[PDB]
Amino acid sequence: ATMADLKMQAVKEICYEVALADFRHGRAEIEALAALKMRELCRTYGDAWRAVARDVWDTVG
Amino acid sequence: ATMADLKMQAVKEICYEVALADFRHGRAEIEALAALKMRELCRTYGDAWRAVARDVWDTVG
Amino acid sequence: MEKLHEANNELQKKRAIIEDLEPRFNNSSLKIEELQEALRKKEEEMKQMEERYKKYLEKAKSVIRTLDPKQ
Amino acid sequence: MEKLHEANNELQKKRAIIEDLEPRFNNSSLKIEELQEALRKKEEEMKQMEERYKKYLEKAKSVIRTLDPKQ
């Protein structure tokens, strides 16, 4: 449960979603879907989404 | 790590080799990657390959 | 003088031909160039479309490379 | 014959025109049908290129769907 893999999971779980939505999502959408993914993951097990959403954009165009 | 674990991993990892290779792989090419994968999973961890290739092809063919 | 009306008859027959051919050719010279521009315009449809699918199938391949199952 | 040498001089001039145009038009009925064939071939190769691109797209999403990380 290191943050580096909570982040890594949100990265994976965002990419998946944007692809199966036919890369419909743009950046602001992704940054929002990064925070939400990040606040719901921390409530599973702050500035974490910035490095998540960046890693997301840096792999979906 | 039961047999379903080995099969389901085999499919996920052949569906990845089949994908990054630009979907150059056909059925017999795929029937033989699963005996590779299955065998090398019972060596790291019989007829399972047959159901693995059918699960793969279903998804890539 | 028989030749004279013979030659006038042949005269007017042969200009009915060149008064038929000039617009028949002129209009085709439109058709060929018409057909020629649709080819160029069709070859651009392929570029844009092929280039549209190449784009999202890298993103797909990228998304596939991120969920590497060997993790 | 004044008039005959005349019409005949015009007659020589008008079949040297046909003999110039009839090929310039014949080979052009041809070009019409080479461009039409090429247009249909291209219209096909895009129909299939597209269907080839749509299918790899679904083959990508399916491999994506298997690689669900939540599973």
Author numbering:
A (entry chain A), B (entry chain B): 742 to 786, 793 to 808
C (entry chain C), D (entry chain D): 552 to 622
Paper quotes:
Hook microtubule tethering protein 3 (Hook3), a cargo adaptor protein that serves as a crucial scaffold protein linking cargo to microtubule motors, plays a pivotal role in regulating bidirectional early endosome trafficking, managing directional movement, and maintaining Golgi morphology. Among these domains, the Hook domain together with the first and second coiled coils serve as the dynein-binding region, whereas the third coiled coil-containing the carboxyl-terminal region interacts with several proteins, including fused toes homolog (FTS), FTS−Hook−FHIP1B (FHF) complex subunit Hook interacting protein 1B (FHIP1B), and kinesin family member 1 C (KIF1C). KIF1C, a kinesin-3 family member with plus-end-directed motility, mediates the anterograde (plus-end-directed) transport of vesicles containing several components, such as α5β1 integrin, 14-3-3, and protein tyrosine phosphatase non-receptor type 21 (PTPN21). A previous study showed that KIF1C exists as an autoinhibited homodimer, and becomes activated by interacting with the carboxyl-terminal region of Hook3 or the FERM domain of PTPN21.
We verified the direct intermolecular interaction between Hook3 and KIF1C, and revealed their binding modules, which subsequently led to determination of the crystal structure of Hook3(553–624) bound to KIF1C(714–809) in a 2:2 heterotetrameric form. In this complex, residues 553–618 of Hook3, which constitute the parallel coiled coil, consist of two distinct types of heptad repeats. As shown in Fig. EV2B, the coiled-coil conformation of Hook3 is maintained by an elaborate network of hydrophobic interactions. This homodimeric Hook3 coiled-coil acts as a scaffold for complex formation with two KIF1C(714–809) molecules, in which residues 742–786 and 793–807 are visible in our complex crystal structure. KIF1C(714–809) forms an antiparallel three-helical bundle consisting of α1 (residues 744–762), α2 (residues 768–785), and α3 (residues 795–807). The protein folding of KIF1C(714–809) is sustained by intensive intramolecular hydrophobic interactions between the residues constituting the three α-helices, which include Lys748, Val752, Ile755, and Val759 from α1; Phe764 from the α1–α2 loop; Ile771, Ala775, Ala776, and Met779 from α2; Trp796, Val799, Ala800, Val803, Trp804, and Val807 from α3. Our crystal structure revealed several key hydrophobic residues from the α1 helix and the α1–α2 loop of KIF1C that directly contribute to the complex formation, in which each single KIF1C protomer recognizes both molecules of homodimeric Hook3. Specifically, the main Hook3-binding interface of KIF1C is constituted by Lys753, Tyr757, Ala760, and Leu761 from α1; Asp763 and Phe764 from the α1–α2 loop, which are associated with Tyr607, Lys610, Ala611, Val614, and Leu618 of one Hook3 molecule and Lys612, Ile615, Arg616, and Pro620 of another Hook3 protomer that coordinately form a large extended hydrophobic surface on the Hook3 homodimer.
